[PDB]
Design an enzyme around this catalytic site. Structure first.
Site, PDB file in Angstrom:
ATOM      1  CG  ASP A  32      -2.029   0.936   1.388  1.00  0.00           C
ATOM      2  OD1 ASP A  32      -2.314   1.717   0.452  1.00  0.00           O
ATOM      3  OD2 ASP A  32      -2.523   1.272   2.473  1.00  0.00           O
ATOM      4  CB  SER A  35      -1.328   3.337   4.479  1.00  0.00           C
ATOM      5  OG  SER A  35      -0.995   2.002   4.107  1.00  0.00           O
ATOM      6  CG  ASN A  37       1.214   3.089  10.345  1.00  0.00           C
ATOM      7  OD1 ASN A  37       0.508   4.019   9.951  1.00  0.00           O
ATOM      8  ND2 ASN A  37       1.953   3.191  11.432  1.00  0.00           N
ATOM      9  CD1 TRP A  39      -1.126  -2.209   9.786  1.00  0.00           C
ATOM     10  CD2 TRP A  39      -2.092  -4.176  10.280  1.00  0.00           C
ATOM     11  NE1 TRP A  39      -2.280  -2.341   9.019  1.00  0.00           N
ATOM     12  CE2 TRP A  39      -2.882  -3.524   9.274  1.00  0.00           C
ATOM     13  CE3 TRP A  39      -2.490  -5.436  10.719  1.00  0.00           C
ATOM     14  CZ2 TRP A  39      -4.064  -4.041   8.770  1.00  0.00           C
ATOM     15  CZ3 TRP A  39      -3.634  -5.976  10.183  1.00  0.00           C
ATOM     16  CH2 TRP A  39      -4.414  -5.291   9.224  1.00  0.00           C
ATOM     17  CE1 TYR A  75      -5.705  -0.011  10.152  1.00  0.00           C
ATOM     18  CE2 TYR A  75      -4.018   0.018   8.424  1.00  0.00           C
ATOM     19  CZ  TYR A  75      -4.505  -0.431   9.631  1.00  0.00           C
ATOM     20  OH  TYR A  75      -3.792  -1.308  10.426  1.00  0.00           O
ATOM     21  CG  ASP A 214      -4.190   4.532  -2.409  1.00  0.00           C
ATOM     22  OD1 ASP A 214      -3.645   3.427  -2.208  1.00  0.00           O
ATOM     23  OD2 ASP A 214      -4.877   5.168  -1.562  1.00  0.00           O
ATOM     24  CB  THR A 217      -7.662   3.445  -3.986  1.00  0.00           C
ATOM     25  OG1 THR A 217      -7.674   4.024  -2.667  1.00  0.00           O
ATOM     26  CG2 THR A 217      -9.009   3.874  -4.572  1.00  0.00           C
TER      27      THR A 217
END
EC number: 3.4.23.-
Length: 324
Positions: A32, A35, A37, A39, A75, A214, A217
């Protein structure tokens, strides 16, 4: 430095592998660009979403180091809970020690359960990292792991296999013509500026449009107001609430083009229309994220399957070349 084939779920989701731990526990993460992060489902999570995903177990990695810092990362709805830690993370081959990971604690949304990836690997800028997590790429960066400080994406169509994430190199067998560069207007998302919108070689909406690039998306999204005139253009009409239009009318539908740095790059109906048999849906939607300037376009998977995409962090710019 290397690339890998990653997977395509119905042209919606492009997800692939990464390894965490000593010895390595392997996970499918959404790659992604929208974004920053990192995780993964973790054994500290017991929500239902967490139950059907591959959980990361910190006790079975002799390289793990915990941090009690929790994260609350909504998010743009995803909206989970996590705890920060440190372990070695590998992506595309043999690389990153003391990599800060988020281990989930609670993961809901009527998509974590049925989403096909176990976590998310964010590729945007440090600025949008919830709770200050160091993005992956920034570390490969700092640790001088890549040949060049670039990554690029090839996305496949109709769900075929063949999507690729190239790190520290560009894959030359994936594009035709020239690389069309434009600089990052803001070091948040991979934001670029649009000089104009055109429909059939003619104007129609922009002089100040920003577009986030993105992979997260699945759609091309347009500014809330202008969505409508574009709708009015191809003939789409609200259907399960999709904007559909007759197939049969499709080869004669308008070409959309964005003027980015003096070059007007096309987007054919073949690209914004998903013909998923006898049914032609309009893969275009309304822009949902708030503009911290003036309304924005989101170039999700529909642009990215037409354009091979290069992300350049030493020069702050994104480049497009026609996908092959």
């Amino acid at each position: 430095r290397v690339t890998e084939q990653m997977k395509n779920e119905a042209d919606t989701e492009y997800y692939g592998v990464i390894s965490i731990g000593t010895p390595p526990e392997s996970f499918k993460v959404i790659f992604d660009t929208g974004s920053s992060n990192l995780w993964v489902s973790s054994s500290h999570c017991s929500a239902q979403a967490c139950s059907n995903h591959n959980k990361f177990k910190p006790r079975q990695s002799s390289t793990y180091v915990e941090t009690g810092k929790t994260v609350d990362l909504t998010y743009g709805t995803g909206g989970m809970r996590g705890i920060l830690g440190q372990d070695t993370v590998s992506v595309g081959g043999g690389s990153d020690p003391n990599q800060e990971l988020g281990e989930s604690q609670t993961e809901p949304g009527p998509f974590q359960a049925a989403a096909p990836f176990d976590g998310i690997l964010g590729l945007a800028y440090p600025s949008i990292a919830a709770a200050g997590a160091v993005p992956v790429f920034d570390n490969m960066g700092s640790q001088s792991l890549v040949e060049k400080d670039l990554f690029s994406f090839y996305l496949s169509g109709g769900g075929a296999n063949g999507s690729e994430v190239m790190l520290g190199g560009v894959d030359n067998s994936h594009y035709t013509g020239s690389i069309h560069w434009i600089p990052v207007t803001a070091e948040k998302y991979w934001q670029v500026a649009l000089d104009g919108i055109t429909v059939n070689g003619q104007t129609a909406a922009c002089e100040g449009c920003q577009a986030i690039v993105d992979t997260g998306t699945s759609k091309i999204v347009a500014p809330v107001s202008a969505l409508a005139n574009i709708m009015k253009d191809i003939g789409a009409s609200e259907n399960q609430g999709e904007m559909m239009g007759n197939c049969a009318s499709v080869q004669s539908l308008p070409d959309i083009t964005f003027t980015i740095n003096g070059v007007k790059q096309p987007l054919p109906p073949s690209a914004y229309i998903e013909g998923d048999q006898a049914f032609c849906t309009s893969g275009l939607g309304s822009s949902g994220v708030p503009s911290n300037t003036s309304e924005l376009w989101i170039f999700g998977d529909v642009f990215l399957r037409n354009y091979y995409t290069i992300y350049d962090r030493t020069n702050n710019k994104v480049g497009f070349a026609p996908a092959a």
